[PDB]
Structure formats: C-alpha cells, structure tokens
Subunit: 388 residues, 4 copies
C-alpha cells in the first residue's frame, strides 16, 4: 500500500442523491436490534461502514429504559458495513461514550473515550492494538467529534475538547501516527467555542465545521495545517446560519469572525463546506426543535460576511418529522474527491413518551453532479407499534 494523501480536486456538485438508509427502528418492532445514538459513516479505500454508540442493550429489553442518558460504562463503538443494521451479530469495536474513526489508507483508527466524567480517558486503537492513551486535562467531560477524522500521508487528526459546554472550555488538536500521539496543538483564531467537529480533506490541510454551545448560532470553523501543525479558527460567513436553536433568516446574522449571541447557546452537530466562494450546507427545517432536514447552496456563503442568497434547496426529511445529529464524509473518486453526509433520525423519549427508550435510525445522501428529483425519507416508525 501507499497512504491516503487525498490530493484530488473536490467534485463540482449540483446537489445530493440518495445513498443508503437502514430502517433500524421499524426493524426493532419485531427484531433484535441495538439501542444507539450519535451515528456516523466513514469509508476504507474500497467500502463504507456505519458506526454508532450502543447503549449496552437492544430495544426489546427491560434494560432499554432511561437510555436518554449520554454516558454510562456500557456504551461501545459499533461497526457494520453501510446498510446492514446493528443486530446481535455486530462487533463492539471498543469502550466509548464518545468517538471518532478513520482509515489512513493502511489500517483503521478509533479514538474511544470512557471513564468518569471528571477523569475520563481516551484510548487510541490502531490496526488492532491499543497503541496510546491520554487522560482528561480539564477534568470536565473529555469529548470528541462523533464523526470521521482525516489522515494525509499517515498523519491523522482528531480534535477534542475538555471543559465547559456552556462556557469557556479547553480545545486541542491531536496529530497521531500509527496510533501514537506525535503532536498536540491548542486552538487559535477567533472561535469562542468548538464542540463536535465535522472535518474533511481540503487537501494540504483539514477543515472542520463545528458546534458552539455558548455564544453562537452561527457555526465555527477550524483550519488545520498538516505540515507545521498551525491552527486557525473563525465562523462561517453566511447569515443563513447552521445551528439549532437559531433566530430565523429575517433576523439572523454572522460576520465570519465572532459568535453572534442569537439564541447563541445550546446546539447540534451539523456540517458545511466551501466551494470556491460558495457554501453547501444542511440544517433542521425547524429553528426551534431538531425536526426536518434541508440542504441548499448559499451564494457567497463562504466569502461574504452575511450572505443570505440561497439556491439548489432540498428537503431530505419533511417538517412534520424528527431528525437530530448529522455530519459529513468524503470519498475519493477516479478523478475528483466527493463529499457526502448522513443524518441521525432519533426516536422515543424526552419527546415521544409513549415509550421509555431512546434510539435512532439513519439515511445517507451523496453529492451528485447530475440530475435529481424530489422526496423526503423519514425514520417511518409508528410509535404505537413499538415496545414499552
């Protein structure tokens, strides 16, 4: 082998074509299916896998009660080929309530984090062996991407954050070769708060569109120079704006520089990416709840400090349906490299309360440069059919 260096143009794109969907929640109504959440999908150089954090349990299981809770000793990183759902024959790849995987182009990397919330620990598993670990630097829930990392020439990159969600916290960027931490850099540039990044290979470095829980509903940006380990950070220019909750596109703002203090705390994992001067982005259809999903292009969304000019929209899930998290993945074609994405469709509690559990399913679309139509592909589970 050689390593993945990702030196091809981004493919020009027109929108997004359907790719995959697993129907996980419908299946659990008469099936032995894992309770999960925070999915992602990533690809080795020949095929793609889906990943998720299990809740140490299946859905038709008295143990599935109260799985709203994010962190317990029984969450584990699941991995299957893209499209086969998480049944009992599924491999738990590590111990983890927070994770991130990628493939340098020889083996797989998994960064997995369990432990006490005040002194968690992250193990670095590469090609089978546990090659490294780190402890919690700020003693407050050590956490990572919940999506794909990226590797150029045998150096991978994850970004992690220890500290306060709704306050100043402590964000570093790890450079890791064959499972060994070979450099740590701290955040620079202007980004007030940088949780749950969605990263990708804009060749000679990496770019992430991340999540601000404190002061922002515009989304952060985190530039990583692969060669000398420099970092830069900003916010996306577009005044269309990526987070939930948010303000509404009459009364929305961003200057590409500072948070916006517009329902500026909480948030959700989401994604974006530049095209020359422009920006493709998705987001919930609701400004308030985590409902619906929509993509579009903003003209100028990358370059100019508040552009609200949107073309090529798409409704991936309709208004009247639930979604949740979301992120990006990149797959190299014969000539260019393409950008794809997934969205977690979460069901049950907090919101729906007829039942006592919390799980999700998924749907995935990939960038097309051709023609496409119109539709909407929700979870599709009648909660009345469901156990508990």
């Amino acid at each position: 082998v050689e390593y993945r260096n990702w030196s091809k143009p981004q493919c020009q794109i027109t929108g997004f074509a359907p790719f995959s969907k697993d129907n996980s929640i419908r299946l659990s109504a008469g099936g032995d299916i894992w309770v999960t959440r925070e999915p992602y999908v990533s690809c080795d150089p020949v095929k793609c896998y889906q990943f998720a954090l299990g809740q140490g349990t299946t859905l038709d299981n008295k143990h599935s009660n109260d799985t709203v809770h994010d962190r317990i000793p029984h969450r584990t990183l699941l991995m299957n080929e893209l499209g086969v759902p998480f049944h009992l024959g599924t491999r738990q790849v590590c111990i983890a309530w927070s994770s991130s995987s990628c493939h340098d182009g020889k083996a797989w990397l998994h960064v997995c984090i369990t432990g006490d919330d005040k002194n968690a620990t992250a193990s670095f598993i590469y090609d089978g062996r546990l090659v490294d670990s780190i402890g919690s630097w700020s003693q407050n829930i050590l956490r990572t991407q919940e999506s794909e990392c990226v590797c150029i020439n045998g150096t991978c990159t994850v970004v992690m954050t220890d500290g306060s969600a709704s306050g100043r916290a402590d964000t570093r960027i790890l450079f890791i070769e064959e499972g060994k931490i070979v450099h740590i850099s701290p955040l620079a540039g202007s980004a007030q708060h940088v949780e749950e990044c969605s990263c990708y290979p804009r060749y000679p470095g990496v770019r992430c569109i991340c999540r601000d829980n404190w002061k922002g509903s515009n989304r952060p940006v985190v530039d990583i120079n692969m060669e000398d380990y420099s970092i830069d950070s900003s916010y996306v220019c577009s005044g269309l704006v990526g987070d939930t909750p948010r303000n509404d596109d009459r009364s929305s703002n961003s200057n590409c520089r500072d948070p916006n203090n517009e329902r500026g705390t909480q948030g959700v994992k989401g994604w974006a990416f530049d095209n020359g001067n422009d920006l493709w982005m998705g987001r919930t259809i609701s400004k308030d709840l985590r409902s619906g999903y929509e993509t579009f292009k903003v003209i100028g969304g990358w370059s100019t400090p508040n552009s609200k000019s949107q073309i090529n929209r798409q409704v991936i899930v309709d208004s009247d349906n639930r979604s949740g998290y979301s992120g990006i993945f990149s797959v190299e074609g014969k000539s260019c490299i393409n950008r794809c994405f997934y969205v977690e469709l979460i069901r049950g509690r907090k919101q729906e309360t007829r039942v006592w559990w919390t799980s999700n399913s998924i749907v995935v679309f990939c960038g097309t440069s051709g023609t496409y139509g119109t539709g909407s592909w929700p979870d599709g589970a009648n909660i009345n059919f469901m156990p508990i």
Copy 2:
C-alpha cells in the same frame, strides 16, 4: 481482470433442472424475516446472489400491515448469496422501489430509484461510490427492469421507462460506463409499450423480452446494438403468447409486429429467448390470475408469425398454487453460456386476506442439456400458521 464480453455460443438445452429455493415464507412463521417483493438473481463471475425490494420491515411486525403498496420511502435493495434468505443480518444495498443490478466483470452496478412518483430520481452506484444520477423526464413514475442488466466490455445497459403504464409512455436506453451515463437512446422499432424488461447477452448486442400494459398480451422485444447504440423493437412471433391476462391458445394471436388487443392491457414480468428459430418460454398456468408456472419450447416461436407448436413442456408450479413475477439470468460456462430463470412466489394480501401483509419467496431453475424428471415446487406455507 478483464471485462465480461460474453462471446460464447448459447448452450443447447433440453429443459430446466432445479437450482435453488429459499423457503422464505415458511421461515417467517418462526423467524425474523424481511418483507419483500420483485426478486431477481444475478451472478458475479464466481457466484450468484439473490436481490429483492424490502418493505422496510419484517413479517412478524405491526409495521407489515398494508404492504400491498408498491412505493414508499422505506423500500431498499437487499442482496445475499443465492440461498441464504433475507434475515436481519442482511445488507440493504441502496434506497429503491425499483432497481436493476449487474456485474461488468470488475465491479457491481446497481440502479436504484426512490422519490416522489412525479419527480423520482435514480442513483447510479458502481463499486461502492455513487457515480451518477438522473431525474424523472416525464414526471410519471420513473421505473426500471426489476431484473438483471448486462455489460459487454465495460459498457452496461439498462432500459427505463417514465410515463403512463396504461397509455403511451417514454422509454429510453441508457449506456453506462463505470457508473457514468455515457449515452441515452430512445426506443425505436414497433413496440407500443415496453415495461419491466428481461434482458440478456445475445453476444454483440443485448435482447430483452418486456411487458406491455396497454395494448398487448403478446410480449415485446427490444434489440440493443452495443456498438453504435441503435435500438429495434417488435413482438415475439409465437401465437402461444406470454402475458397474464391473456386470451387462451385456441383464440390467441401474434404477428411479431404490433400489439394484439387481446385482453391487451395489464400484465406481468416474464421472459423468453430465441434458439435459432425456436423459442423457450415460461408463463403462468392461468390465463386469468398469476397462478402456476410452466415452461415449454415453441417450434417456430421465434421466426414464424403465429406458431402454436409446443414441445418439452414443464410444470414448475402447479395450477392450484400462486406465483407472480419472473425473469431470466445468464451464466457463462467453460465453453458455452447458459440461460437460467427465477419465479417470485407471492403470498398474502389482496388475494389471501386471513393476514394483512404481502411478501414472497422464490424457486430457481437452470437450463440443462441432460435428462430430467417431473415435479412442482410451490411456496408451501400454510396461511393458517401465519401471523396477523
């Protein structure tokens, strides 16, 4: 590798020997088995797989209610090795309520179609990556083969149709290399209506025996020149005649040229193939319902404009049992290339109403040039044993 060019004689044949059967419906009576329909089977250069459209659900599942409906956001293309049935550990290969797969002799192609009925979209997935897509040209249910495509030298061929089922509609033929559409040709020749084709490699081009919903109970023919992209279309000569519903072989007709207006609308997916001047064909045993299946040879069925001379008959499923769809697949031997076929045996609703779901099973036979006996191999599920 080289590519599949299929340049070998057709094997001379005497009839058909059993090959496979999956018992899918019996198994669901105490098992966790997918709800499907429209199967097919196709083969990579070393083994064969079975394919079907799932209904986003399993049979012992409140969600299985009302699965008569053909198109929803949760249908997905399943794929297993030929003979292992669709359990929970099965990979959903794409999003689709209409499909077609083949293997050029390096990778797999899948053409998958979901969306709104008025503006569906078809994704082209080859070797993992989404390489292309197209939108709905006539804004009325974009649809395809529901069986195997065929590839010669790295150019594959699918035929698709947008428009009216019971009226004039819009039929084109796509030429696609490594997942990229490289040519589209429209239908020519005399065929009034060309749904659900069963295609195959009569070397230097491809031949399909298709389905007419509008004016015909004789079956269409669709010749495809692989080299310059010409098309021709006609109807099968034989007055024995392939569709259901149909007229009965005293009062049946075809001239090889025009539809026959003999209970000439609806139809079913079915197959045929020439042998010099002759025709091997199968069909339901019933002229009225989709019941029983039988094969035979018509002497002159290919060449002469109404031949009703049949030899080598075979009853694959008896009169008193249900069938449904059906199609052909081709597998290359050491010296010649052989032709095989499958039949979808569908159970439950509309017809049987004790239960509320709709699924099928399958049986598959391959062409033999040797001896054979007599039998009949139906689904075999006691509907009273069944859930719902």
Copy 3:
C-alpha cells in the same frame, strides 16, 4: 492448484478422539434453528463443513408438524462450517431430499435430487454452475449416499440407486468430471442390495460400505476402480455385523459373499474400513432400535469369513440414549490420511411423541493414534423443555 489425488498411507490408529458437537436440539428450545435430518460432514483442503437436509422449516414453527416424512418439495441442502449450527443465516445450497458432496481439490460438487418419487431428477452443481442432470431410470425413488463422495485427480464418484428398497433395485456408479457425467457403470460382484453408501479413498480406487434393506444384516462392499471403471461388490467378512436390526453376536453370521437372511431387511446408514486384515467399525448398541453407538476393532474382520474377535471398543453414546444414521469422512494429514466419522442423533416423533416434529443433532470423532479415556456424548435435550 493441483487436484486431490489422495496418495498417502492410511494413518495407523488406536481408536477415536472427540472432534465436534453442535447441540442443535438444546438450542432450538430458545433459538431459531432449522429442522433437519440425514447429516454428514466433508472437508475442503483447509477446513470442514457440516451438511444436512432441512425440512423447509425451523423448530418453533407450526410448519414443523409431521416432519417424519422424508420427501417434500421444501427439503434443501444446508452447509455451514463444522461447529456453527444451522441458524437462519444458513445458506441453502440446492433443492434436495437426497444428496452427496465432495471437493475435488479445486471446487465443491453437490449432487441434489428432488422431484416426484416416480420421476425424480438429480442436478449436478459444480463450482456454482449447474453443469449436468439425469432423470430417474427405474421410476422408483432415485436416491444417493447421504454422505461424502470422493475424487482422485479430478474424477469424482457417486453411487446411486433407483428401484425397490425391499426388493431387487437398480444401482449404478457415476464418474463425473467438473460436474459432467463422463461414465456410468452398473453394479457387479455379489451384493444383493446396496443403499446409502459410505465411501472413501483407499488410494487407487474407492471403497464403500453400504446398506442392505432386503436380504442382509451383514453390510455390503462396493469396490470402484478409478482407472477403467470396473466395479466389484461383496459383504464384510466379520460375523460381528453392522446393520440394525440384527441377530445378536452369539447367533450372528457372515461369509463375506452373500446376504445372511438374519432379520435381513430394513437397515440404517453405517460405516466401516479395513486395516490390513482387520476392521474398525461402529454400530448401534441396540440390535433392535437405533439406540446407542459403539465402535471397536475386529481382529480378522476384513479377511476371515466370520471373525467375532473384538478389541479396542468405545461407547460414543450410551445404551439409554437415541442415535440414528452415521458415516465416514477422510482428511489428509502431512504424512498419512486419516479416517473420521459422525453420527446423527435424532429426536422427536415416531418414537418420542410428546412433541410433533422430527429433527436431529450431531457429534463427531476422529481417528487418533494416541491415548484416550472414556465417556458418552448424547444429544442431551430434555424433551419436556421442548416446543409442541
């Protein structure tokens, strides 16, 4: 590759060491497990598989009622690695109520037989493709080994029988190269009746110890010359004697030549093999029912016309437990080639009637040239725990 030519000495042996067991019946008491019978195990040049005839159903399944019956359209040849039991994720390899498999040392051969009892048909599947078939010559239940065939240099051998079980019937020996029948020879020598053979590679030819349903409780022998296709047949010399029912070893007889007319009809599948002049053999512990299993060596059992001198006995299943069929398999070591065997342990109806189904499990032992102890390894299922 080259082909399997099996030119190594038989390993000298002291007895038999345990090898495998699948616990299939216990598992079905809370599991989704196939209803089967007539097992065998055979090995490709790197690992071993278990095979069985399914009943188109699983055990906790209203469809499992009345599965005493041997022949229906839903029996199918199952295949797994040795030790993983027949769950829902198991591949049905062909249509068959009678079968036999082997591996020439490049691909797998399966001979599968379904159809009407008066005009069955046997398909020949080699390396995926259906390469050949034959019809029923005597129009009375065409049937085969229900155990491993054997191949030397790319010519395999199965022996099959059409005709009467309890009367004269019609027995031939097929020679088949890459799935093509290349020679058929009829039975010669002295064997009055030759059902269910257990064959094996005594180098330059093959030897089978078979089953006589008509006139014999001594077991037949069927010698096959691989080079010119000659056949010879006799009975085993030993007066210890291999069938059930049988007479008891005070009042037992064989002359190596003719049947013995000693409770001489019915029978069971069983096995044996020469060692110089001696014979290793197993059989039920009961002369009357198919209960218990025991192995031992007879001194002179091969050469001398009624030897009742037995050493090295072993109780594989105790008197107070059920068994059934049984057969041999051969695996080549680094220096010699070894002989191993399996026994079908059948449960439920006819005999046990608390329940309405009929299935089995298995246990397998291999020849050792070392030390060993004492035990007994039965099915082990409490019928009261069982469904139905």
Copy 4:
C-alpha cells in the same frame, strides 16, 4: 510465513487503558445468547478473538437451569472476534469443559478436554485436523489453563494437571509441534500446587502465574525453558498476594519459596508479571468473595521476599460489584511486546438466586505507556430484568 518467536522487549507501562467489553448478560434479556463461563482472549498476528466454554445452551432456555455444574458432555469451546458476543451464529470449535488456545504464527492450536472425570481425554486440534490425543494419567479430573498458551519458533507449551485440587496432584508440561506432543516434562522447583496457569512469553522461555488450591494464597510461578525443556517453580515474592480467599495486607505473607498456609486452600484464576524487579498484578477487591477487581504495581514485588509497597493502583470493577476469573494475554507491537488482560464477570446462581442459571460477561484492558483517568466498568445487568 515465519513462526512467532516473540523476541522483543516488554513495553514499559504506566497502567492499563480500556480495550473491549461485550455486554453479554444485558443482551440476553432480549436476545439469543450463549450460556458460558471461563473466558479468555488470545490473538492471531493480525487480530484478537474471545473464547469461552458454552453450556450447550442459551439463557432464555429451560435447559439453562442448574448450569453451576462445571463438567457436562455439552460444554464446547466458542470462538468469535473480540467484541462480537456469543450469539447463535457462533462456531463451537471443539468438545471441552477445559481448554487452551494459541497461534504459533501459522495456525491455531486448541487443547480440548472432555470425558469422564476419572478417565477424561484431551484432543489436540491444530489447523483443522485432530493431530494427537492423551488420556488421564491420574484418573482425577484432567484439567488445563483456561487461558492462552504460548509458542516460540513452532513449539507451543501448555501446562496441565491431573490429580487432587485440595491435595497433592500431578502436573506436567507439554511441548507440542504442529499438534503433535513432542515432549512431556514434570513439574520441578518448589510449587506445592499449580492449577489454572496464566502463561506468557518472557522471551527465551515462558512464565506462568498459577493457582494453588491446597496450601497457598500467595500465587505460584512456573518457569519453562523452551530449549532443553527444564522447569522451575516458586511463589511470587510480594506480600501483597494474589489469591481469593486471602488474609489481608496487614496480616499477609510470602517468602517466594513455599506456600503460606493463610486461608491457603481454594482459589481463583488470576495473573501477574515481572518488570525488572517489580510486579504488576490484579486481584479482587474482596479478600473473601470474588468481588471487585483492582490492579497496581508493587515496588520490589518480584525480587524481595515480602514487599508490600504498592503504587499505580486502578479499580477496574468497584467493590459493590461481582467479578470472577481473569488472566493475561500478550500482543506484539512494532518495537516492544505488550501485556493485556481480561476479567470474567459472572452473574446468577449460587450467589444471586432470583434466577436459576449461571453465565458471565467480560471487560478487557491493555497496557498503556501513556496517561489515563479513573472509572469502573461492571457487568451492569439488573437481575430483576432477567429470565427465570
């Protein structure tokens, strides 16, 4: 290939990072999961597998009653990739109520032991074939490691014991090449009693830390010279002391030479390993029951005849939770070779009696040379949710 010779330094280590956990017991509450106990994990040169002794049954199964009993004809050696739990699709690799596996660096070795307690027999399975066997030398429960063996240059080593648990018994050390016993050596040195060894490759020979049931709560040591087959045996120097039951570290003792007669009988499988002069070790947190697990380093624990100086502690399972067995496994890195371990967490009867079955789950940690935090990862199954 070449063979595994394990000639690399031990990796210096700081402690242990989490690696894996399978959640087996929680899953059985709505899942089809094997009843087991005595796990271990071992690795081929590219990945790791988990192993366990099944009880011929699954947990939601009337057959699971009374599975406290250690030895029956239905125990079987299970094997999966590390992290996928023992479902119905799991391969039973041999017949066994006592076992040990390893991989010489070309194939897998399994030593499996079933039979009568007074005349058991151990089969030696290597690379598929049964290559050898031995009988019971002392006619009292022949037994082995219940963890990983180790192989240097194509000679493997298991240590086995026949005789009395609570008395003098008969302990030998087998040297075995490609499944053939090529040398047997008896125990020498000072070790009064040597059950259930945990062995590992301290290059040119092997070292085991074993279990004394008779006179000791300090743990034995069993040195094996790979070159001429010499043996030595002692006890661990540390006065901290490894067994359960034990005396408490105020009133604890060891001189590295003789048993200690301090609650000196029974015991549990456990592990340790030298580092220069020091000792890393784990043990239950309870001196009385098999509850909790903790690791730490003893300064001088290797070299000096009663050292009670402990640094680097870790609580792997908390006081208020159950554990059981435990052992070590070694995996070679790029430069050094690392040492890892697993602990069996056992649930149900004897102790918990609301239910009638006995199974376990597992958790596994690997040696890190980096940073780490704090936590505790128990089985996590609410016994009230459980069947029976």
